[PDB]
C-alpha cells in the first residue's frame, strides 16, 4: 500500500542538513592507549552484543 507523493519543502531541507566538522586533531591531542578494564565489563559486553 504505497504511493509516491510530492516532497514537502522542509523535508527537502532536512534531507541535506549539515553540521560543522568536529574533533579535528582531537585523537592526536588526547592520545590513546590499550585498556584493560574489569573482566566483568568485558564478559557483560559479550552477552550484550550476543
Amino acid at each position: 500500500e504505497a504511493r509516491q507523493v510530492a516532497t514537502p519543502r522542509e523535508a527537502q531541507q532536512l534531507a541535506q542538513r549539515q553540521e560543522a566538522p568536529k574533533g579535528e586533531g582531537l585523537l592526536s591531542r588526547l592520545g590513546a592507549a590499550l585498556a584493560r578494564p574489569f573482566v566483568a565489563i568485558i564478559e557483560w559486553l559479550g552477552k550484550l552484543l550476543g
Partner: protein
C-alpha cells in the same frame, strides 16, 4: 542523482510495484499507509530514509536509540531548530541488493507503527 542512488531507488520502486520515477528529483517521498516517508542520498553513496512523527510518544526513545544486530534499526532524533521528531535509518549504497533496500523501508515503517 548519482548512479548508485538511482539504481537503488529503481530497485525499491520495483519492489513496491510502482512506476519508476521520475525527474531526477533527489529527495523522494512515499506515503506508506499512515506514514509519509522521505528518501534521500545523504551523504553521497548513502541511502537515507526518514519519517516525521505526528505526536507519537517517545517514552521508549532511548531504547529505540540503542544499537541492535540490525544496522537498519531506526533511530529517533529531533530537529533542534524545529522541534520535530524524526525517525530515520541509513545504509551505504556500495553494498546493497534490492531485498536489503526494501528491508530498510520495512524497518522504518515498522518502528513508526510500533512507536512507542
Amino acid at each position: 542523482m548519482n548512479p548508485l542512488y538511482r539504481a537503488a531507488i529503481h530497485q525499491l520502486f520495483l519492489a513496491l510495484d510502482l512506476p519508476t520515477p521520475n525527474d531526477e528529483e533527489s529527495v523522494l517521498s512515499l506515503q506508506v499507509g499512515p506514514h509519509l516517508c522521505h528518501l534521500a542520498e545523504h551523504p553521497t553513496d548513502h541511502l537515507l530514509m526518514f519519517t516525521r512523527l505526528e505526536g507519537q510518544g517517545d517514552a521508549t526513545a532511548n531504547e529505540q536509540n540503542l544499537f541492535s544486530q540490525d544496522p537498519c534499526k531506526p533511530i529517533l532524533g529531533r530537529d533542534p531548530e524545529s522541534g520535530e521528531r524524526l525517525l530515520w535509518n541509513r545504509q551505504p549504497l556500495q553494498l546493497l541488493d534490492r531485498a536489503q533496500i526494501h528491508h530498510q523501508l520495512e524497518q522504518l515503517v515498522a518502528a513508526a507503527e510500533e512507536l512507542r
